[PDB]
Amino acid sequence: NLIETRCVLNHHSTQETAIGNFFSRAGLVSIITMPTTGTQNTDGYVNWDIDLMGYAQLRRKCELFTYMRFDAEFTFVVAKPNGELVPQLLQYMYVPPGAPKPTSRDSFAWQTATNPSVFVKMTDPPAQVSVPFMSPASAYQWFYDGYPTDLDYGQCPNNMMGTFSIRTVGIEKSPHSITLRVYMRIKHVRAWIPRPLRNQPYLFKTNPNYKGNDIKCTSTSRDKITTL
Amino acid sequence: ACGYSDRVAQLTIGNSTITTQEAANIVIAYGEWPEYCPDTDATAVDKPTRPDVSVNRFFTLDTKSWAKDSKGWYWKFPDVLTEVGVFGQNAQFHYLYRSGFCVHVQCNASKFHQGALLVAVLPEYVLGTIAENSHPPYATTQPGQVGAVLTHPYVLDAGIPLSQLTVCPHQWINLRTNNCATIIVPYMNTVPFDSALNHCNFGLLVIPVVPLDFNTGATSEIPITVTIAPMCAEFAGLR
Amino acid sequence: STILGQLCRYYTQWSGSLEVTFMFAGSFMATGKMLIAYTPPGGNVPADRITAMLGTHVIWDFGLQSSVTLVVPWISNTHYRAYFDYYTTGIITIWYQTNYVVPIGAPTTAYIVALAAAQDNFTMKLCKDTEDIE
Numbered sequence: 001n002l003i004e005t006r007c008v009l010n011h012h013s014t015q016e017t018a019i020g021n022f023f024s025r026a027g028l029v030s031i032i033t034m035p036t037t038g039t040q041n042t043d044g045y046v047n048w049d050i051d052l053m054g055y056a057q058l059r060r061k062c063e064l065f066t067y068m069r070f071d072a073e074f075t076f077v078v079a080k081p082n083g084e085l086v087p088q089l090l091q092y093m094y095v096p097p098g099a100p101k102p103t104s105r106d107s108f109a110w111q112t113a114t115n116p117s118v119f120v121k122m123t124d125p126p127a128q129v130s131v132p133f134m135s136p137a138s139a140y141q142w143f144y145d146g147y148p149t150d151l152d153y154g155q156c157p158n159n160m161m162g163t164f165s166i167r168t169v170g171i172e173k174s175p176h177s178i179t180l181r182v183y184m185r186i187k188h189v190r191a192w193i194p195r196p197l198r199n200q201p202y203l204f205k206t207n208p209n210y211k212g213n214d215i216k217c218t219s220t221s222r223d224k225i226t227t228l
Numbered sequence: 229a230c231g232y233s234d235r236v237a238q239l240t241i242g243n244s245t246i247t248t249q250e251a252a253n254i255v256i257a258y259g260e261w262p263e264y265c266p267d268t269d270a271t272a273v274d275k276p277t278r279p280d281v282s283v284n285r286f287f288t289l290d291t292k293s294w295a296k297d298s299k300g301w302y303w304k305f306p307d308v309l310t311e312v313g314v315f316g317q318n319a320q321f322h323y324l325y326r327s328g329f330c331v332h333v334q335c336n337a338s339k340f341h342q343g344a345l346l347v348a349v350l351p352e353y354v355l356g357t358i359a360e361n362s363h364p365p366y367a368t369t370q371p372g373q374v375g376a377v378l379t380h381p382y383v384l385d386a387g388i389p390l391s392q393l394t395v396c397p398h399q400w401i402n403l404r405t406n407n408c409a410t411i412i413v414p415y416m417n418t419v420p421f422d423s424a425l426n427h428c429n430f431g432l433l434v435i436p437v438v439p440l441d442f443n444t445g446a447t448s449e450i451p452i453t454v455t456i457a458p459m460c461a462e463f464a465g466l467r
Numbered sequence: 468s469t470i471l472g473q474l475c476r477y478y479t480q481w482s483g484s485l486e487v488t489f490m491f492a493g494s495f496m497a498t499g500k501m502l503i504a505y506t507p508p509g510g511n512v513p514a515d516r517i518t519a520m521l522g523t524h525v526i527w528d529f530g531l532q533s534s535v536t537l538v539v540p541w542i543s544n545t546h547y548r549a550y551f552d553y554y555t556t557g558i559i560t561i562w563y564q565t566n567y568v569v570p571i572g573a574p575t576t577a578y579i580v581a582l583a584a585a586q587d588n589f590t591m592k593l594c595k596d597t598e599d600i601e
Contacts, residue, residue: 066352067418137418143352145304145369146427153363154354158418193258193351193416194395200387203359210387212358215380218389236531243523247532288502288520291565313521336498336530338570373517443571451565453500455526 019191023061026075026185029054032166033081035177044105044174045167047095048182049160050131053142053205066193067139070186072161076120076127078180085122086176089169092127093117097134097160105167119169122178130187134161139192154207229253229399230334231406242285246455248334248408257349257397257413262328262459268420270324276421276462277322282314287456289373292434293449294335294343300378300435301452304353304428305329305413307370308456315458322463325424326415332455333434334408335401340446344438346390347409348398351416353431355385370428381435390435402438403450412459421464471585475544476597482543483589487559488536491529493569493577498530500564501579503537508555516562526564538586 015021032046050072053059062068076092079085095101095115102109109115120127133140137158144156164182168174199218200210222228234249265276287309292301306327309315319325333347355364368376378385384393399409417429432454440450475481489503504519506512513519527535537559545553561579569575 135418139418141352141418143354144427145352145354145429145431146423148426150366150369151363153369195350196384196388196390196392196395198387199389200383202387204361207363208354208356208386208388209359209362210356210383212380215383218391238532244520244526245524246526247528247535249531282521286526288526288564290517291500293566312517336500336528336565336568338496338498338568338573340570445571447566447568447570449566450568451499453526453565 019189023070023186023189026073026183027055027058028181029058029184030182032180032182033178034166034168034180035081036173036175045102045165047101047163047165049163051205052184056202059202060198063142063198064194065191066143066195067141067191069133069139069188069190071133071188072131073185073187074129074131074164075183075185076180077183078122078126078178081177081179088122088174088176088178089119090122090178091117091119091167091169092129093165093167094129094131095163095165097162101163102165102167105173106171109165110167115165131162135159139190143195229255229401229406229410230408239286241457242282244286244288246286246288246332248332248455251406251408251410253406254410254412255397255399257411258416260414262412262414264460265326265415265420265462270421270466271464274464274466276324276326276464277318278460278462279314279318283318283461284458287312287315287458289375289454289456292375292452292454294345294436294440294452295449296440298377298436298440300381300433301375302353302371302378302431302433303373303375303454304370304431306424307428308373308375308432309458310370310424311372315461318461318463319424322465323423324421324464324466325462326421326464327461328415328459329413330457330459331411331413331432332408332457333399333401333410333432334453334455335403335450336453337403337407337450338442338446341403341440341442341450342438343403343436343440343450345401345409345452346393346398346433346435346437347401347411348393348396348433348435349411349413349430350384350393350396350433351430353386353428353433356387378433378435384433384435390437393433393435421462469583471583473597473599475591476599477594478591479546479593479595480544481589481591482541484541484586485539485583485589486536486586487539487581487583488534489527489561490534490580490582491577492580493529494573496573497567497569497577498528499567500526500528500530502526502562502564503535504560504562505537505539506558506560508542508557510557512558513560513562516564519560519562530568 135158140159203209230249230251234251237250504524543555
């Protein structure tokens with residue numbers, strides 16, 4: 001509707017429209033599930049590569065800019081699938097870029113001193129850690145009009161932020177199923193070169209391809225250009 | 229930029245001379261002038277070649293013809309001059325490249341013609357396809373001197389509204405008034421020097437927003453002429 | 468046809484710069500761009516518009532200037548017998564950068580007039596009666 005009453009005659013604060021405030025707040029970036037036994041868990045571990053283009057909500061927000069630079073704060077909210085908590089010791093390991101990821105529930109990777117790991121009990125309050133600006137370049141870039149060497153187009157590996165490897169501690173498998181929610185917050189944001197806002201549904205994580213038969217209009221329609 | 233009631237001028241840079249009206253109605257991309265790369269450890273042990281020879285001059289590309297049904301065109305940089313002149317062989321023997329550009333799009337039409345072109349520069353112009361998964365071919369990602377034609381101009385072949393392309397360095401060419409646009413583009417990247425053959429720092433788009441029209445009897449195709457001039461071009465081979 | 472070329476026959480050697488002027492006569496309503504290119508002596512005549520553009524050239528928009536002048540930097544001659552000319556000289560090539568644009572009501576064919584002359588540094592030596600008469 002359009003109720004034309006209650007007119008805001010004061011200017012609001014510009015702080016609210018600042019790049020920082022626009023990209024603040026911890027949002028859910030991933031939901032890992034490690035059941036006792038089902039499809040992908042006779043393993044006992046999980047490897048989640050840090051990915052932002054996961055949720056279209058946040059992705060659209062980022063693709064408003066060409067380059068971005070920032071730190072990331074990760075919070076690990078875990079519990080059993082029904083919300084119950086048990087005295088289970090877990091380990092979250094950060095495998096930097098260029099480092100080898102665990103390939104089994106007990107690879108050497110889990111003992112490698114250089115892969116920082118945080119140990120916490122599912123009873124303890126959520127673990128929290130900050131990851132810096134990993135790129136070897138001055139900024140992450142959501143668009144690369146070149147090739148890093150076709151099927152490898154637009155792909156820039158200098159945005160690779162790392163991997164998080166989750167697993168229960170202990171030599172034997174855990175009796176409990178675990179559902180872990182990963183929250184991320186962008187700190188100290190800086191953005192460059194603003195670009196048009198995505199107006200077509202997303203088709204893939206790694207590229208702007210859009211459905212070309214069903215091209216949606218940026219705006220809704222009306223009958224005549226005079227009817228309002 | 230340039231229109232009627234502007235004193236005609238003859239600019240020369242090297243062995244090139246273009247006659248174009250002096251209209252200080254120029255667009256300077258993102259507010260910055262093209263400059264020579266600040267110091268970096270890499271070219272601090274191997275200075276960057278700055279061929280002011282036949283590299284800093286006016287490269288006038290082949291003229292494109294605008295008809296009543298044209299969808300628009302686009303060229304990628306530095307790709308466009310990769311296959312041309314000393315900027316080409318200079319951009320192939322050298323590992324690292326860096327440069328800026330004075331871009332000049334120009335029209336030639338009669339006062340009985342009508343139309344409006346939008347000229348814009350879009351950094352990191354990545355393209356998409358109609359789709360299944362299939363990253364666009366090398367022939368449409370790097371079109372060369374000829375340039376390429378947009379297939380879905382409304383979403384710029386990348387799923388983004390043309391209606392919003394103006395948040396990028398642009399300049400309109402309304403046949404009614406001015407017949408030419410000028411844009412100064414500075415180097416933009418996440419690192420001082422990139423490969424001139426792998427990465428295309430940006431794209432030049434010329435899309436007709438208000439279609440060409442005229443009465444039958446007038447020249448049916450209006451010529452769009454693009455002239456490029458590298459500014460503060462640097463090359464670093466690392467030897 | 469030029470007064471210069473006629474007087475050159477009255478001498479054996481000569482050298483200097485030359486300037487060629489092009490004048491466009493078509494309707495005031497016509498516009499378009501022509502590309503003028505000078506290919507230096509001992510150079511391959513341009514094959515296409517694009518190569519000509521890479522050499523010494525001038526983009527002439529007759530919608531803006533009704534006339535444009537090109538300068539041949541340097542020519543030389545040392546006339547001998549065996550009849551052969553030790554003529555060091557370039558090639559002027561006129562290309563269509565854009566097509567000829569015109570509205571309704573205007574001629575679709577116009578003409579260009581070419582005028583030429585020697586510059587100040589031009590000089591000649593060693594007289595010799597011409598072969599232009601009989």
